[PDB]
């Protein structure tokens, strides 16, 4: 929900979290709620 949001909005710059396997966290799905895109996406440009 509201993915175009985090692709668009202001973002607070966070210090390095020092977490290994960011790709692995995602591909193993540690998180219930994630959206990824492998290559660049026009899905944030439609605002209805």
């Amino acid at each position: 929900e509201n993915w175009q949001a985090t692709e668009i909005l202001p973002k607070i710059e966070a210090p390095l979290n020092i977490f290994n396997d960011i790709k692995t966290y995602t591909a193993e799905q540690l998180f219930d709620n994630l959206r990824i895109y492998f290559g660049d996406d026009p899905s944030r440009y439609n605002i209805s």
């Binding site: 492998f38 026009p42 899905s43 440009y45 439609n46 605002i47 209805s48």
Partner: protein, 295 residues
């Protein structure tokens, strides 16, 4: 040149999400025109309301292909394709696209158990299936076989022979052709197509007979020999009872040839299948592919 489509009813959030899933697709359009409503978007204003399959095949040949580009707040941007240039097409059909394949539009295998991509107050959205050309030929031949053998009775293997027609396979993706036992959901009924084929195969031998029985003195030397062979191999006992015992009119022969040539240039639709797209590369996981547009 672009085309705007504004829908007629309201849309649910799930419907707008369906469009965002379908943001690249081919849509046929009747009028080559800038502002089109959902009352004429798609192919359901033609199929299901008017003669089906062969006029549908002629119409899918003659409508305007137009691809979705972007969905606005509630409007559709459809860019119509120019010849010789690249576009991008998403994969809706079941058969896997590969590189260098030619693409064509077949009418949808109109089972009424489909998920009905939009269904907006007695209007629904139907797209043609983009498919490789080899499979399109194979699907056309299987449909004509089903429409031929569905009229015969008293085959006691009719269920298994219709099943062996309906099961086709192409690059490890099976599909069952939904024209089973004449459920009449959309059989498409193809009755002029089979009638036209059998008018051709019945009016052929006597027309080539009445032509070849004349002017052999001239040294054609190839045609006369070939027709005797070709005719007397299959129809080995040729013209015993003769029907009328050789009382023909030149006007009758005129009408025979004129009819048998009308049948061909009116089955022109099932004659050929044009290559609407030549796909150059295919993206990963076979979601969409960048192609070039031809014809």
């Amino acid at each position: 040149e672009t085309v705007y489509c504004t829908f007629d009813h309201k849309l649910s959030l799930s419907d707008i999400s369906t469009l965002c899933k379908l943001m690249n697709i081919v849509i046929p359009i009747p009028a080559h025109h800038h502002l089109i409503g959902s009352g004429n978007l798609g192919l359901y204003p033609i199929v299901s309301s008017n003669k089906d399959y062969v006029h549908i095949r002629n119409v899918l040949r003659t409508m305007v292909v137009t691809i979705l580009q972007k969905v606005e707040g509630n409007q559709l941007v459809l860019r119509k394709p120019m010849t010789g240039q690249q576009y991008a097409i998403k994969n809706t059909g079941p058969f896997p696209w590969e590189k260098g394949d030619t693409l064509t539009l077949i009418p949808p295998l109109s089972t009424h158990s489909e998920e009905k991509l939009l269904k907006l107050g007695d209007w629904e959205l139907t797209v043609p299936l983009v498919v490789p050309t080899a499979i399109a030929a194979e699907i056309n031949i299987r449909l004509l076989c089903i429409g031929l053998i569905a009229v015969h009775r008293e085959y006691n293997e009719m269920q298994t022979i219709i099943d062996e027609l309906c099961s086709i396979q192409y690059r490890d993706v099976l599909i069952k052709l939904p024209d089973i036992v004449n459920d009449k959901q959309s059989m498409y009924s193809m009755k002029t197509a089979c009638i036209s084929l059998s008018m051709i195969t019945a009016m052929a031998p006597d027309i080539v007979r009445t032509y070849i029985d004349r002017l052999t003195l001239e040294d054609h030397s190839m045609l006369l020999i070939k027709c005797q062979e070709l005719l007397s191999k299959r129809t080995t006992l040729s013209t015993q009872r003769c029907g009328q015992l050789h009382a023909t009119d030149i006007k009758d022969e005129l009408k025979k040839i004129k009819s048998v040539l009308t049948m061909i240039d009116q089955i022109n639709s099932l004659t050929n299948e044009k290559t609407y797209f030549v796909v150059c590369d295919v993206s990963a996981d076979n979601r969409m592919a960048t192609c070039i547009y031809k014809n």
